Ligand binder design. Structure first.
Ligand SMILES: CCCCCCCCCCCCCCCC(=O)OC[C@H](COP(=O)(O)OCCN)OC(=O)CCCCCCCCCCCCCCC
Length: 261
């Protein structure tokens, strides 16, 4: 129970957890430093409600959109890369998302990939970000061997890692239930972003490495904080939404500052 004090919303959610009526794609208990799987699920339900409320306000939707745009751009230019491609892919990704008629199909795809809830957390934070990080945490058998090769120039290691990323993304694209849907639109973004992150987390640049490491650190810390009952109030939905919003702005400012925007 640690420092957990009695909270209305939290206990309401915990009821559901004990019934078994709260679902999740991947347990993030240890990563997000929760007390237990039960604790994680309760807080998860609460966070879902919080974002569901938060994203009705169009100002906040704009905040998150703009934030994503700027942070990925900053990462890209700090990787000595041009952000134009990513900017366009991101943009029409959003324009596709805003179309209300796309959403049943999107629901089908995401459910087909294990997403158990149409929520900002489930889609953007868990399915898109934390999965990307968990992916670049464990590169293929082959890639690593190419990386520990003393004889290869690191320009070659660059193009090699790029090729590997494209190969993985290709195998993923082959399994698309829909050619031009949510996950495809996202696979283009991934096409323009994943190589950079990969060569940051695995490459020997050592200044791309620091930037990437700190980027990931900021995101993961943001999520940890979001699941911290002492950082945010799991008492009511309006209060949790207020706290999560402020946390978002804070950590955003921090990351922007680090990237030099
Ligand atoms: C430091 C940390 C800072 C905070 C984190 C910032 C994260 C930035 C996220 C930017 C997108 C916000 C979308 C706002 C609209 C919304 O949220 O839509 C919430 C809806 C549920 O609501 P709805 O269906 O009822 O309709 C809502 C009205 N449209 O589901 C969604 O998610 C759909 C939106 C999906 C957008 C995907 C964008 C992917 C960006 C990937 C970045 C590159 C990563 C590459 C990794 C290889």
């Amino acid at each position: 129970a640690g420092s957990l004090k009695p909270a209305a919303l939290y206990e309401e959610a915990l009821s559901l957890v004990k019934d078994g009526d709260v679902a999740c794609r991947s347990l993030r208990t240890e990563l997000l430093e929760c007390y237990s799987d039960q604790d994680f699920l309760a807080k998860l339900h609460c966070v879902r409600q919080a974002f569901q409320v938060l994203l009705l306000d169009e100002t906040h939707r704009m905040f998150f959109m703009e934030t994503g745009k700027q942070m990925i751009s900053g990462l890209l230019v700090k990787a000595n890369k041009s952000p134009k491609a990513f900017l366009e892919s991101y943009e029409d990704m959003l324009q596709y998302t805003q179309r209300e008629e796309t959403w049943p199909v999107s629901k089908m795809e995401l459910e087909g990939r294990g997403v158990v809830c149409m929520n900002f957390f489930d889609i953007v934070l868990d399915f898109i970000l934390m999965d990307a990080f968990e992916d670049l945490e464990s590169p293929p058998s082959s890639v690593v061997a190419v990386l520990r090769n003393r004889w290869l120039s690191d320009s070659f290691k660059e193009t090699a890692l790029a090729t590997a990323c494209w190969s993985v993304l290709k195998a993923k694209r082959r399994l698309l239930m829909v050619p031009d849907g949510f996950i495809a639109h996202f696979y283009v973004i991934s096409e323009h972003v994943s190589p950079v992150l990969a060569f940051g987390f695995l490459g020997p640049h050592q200044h791309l490495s620091e930037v990437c490491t700190i980027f990931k650190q900021q995101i993961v810390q943001y999520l940890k904080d979001m699941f911290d009952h002492d950082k945010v109030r799991f008492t009511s939905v309006p209060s949790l939404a207020e706290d999560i919003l402020r946390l978002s702005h804070r950590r955003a400012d921090i990351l922007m500052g680090y990237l030099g925007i």
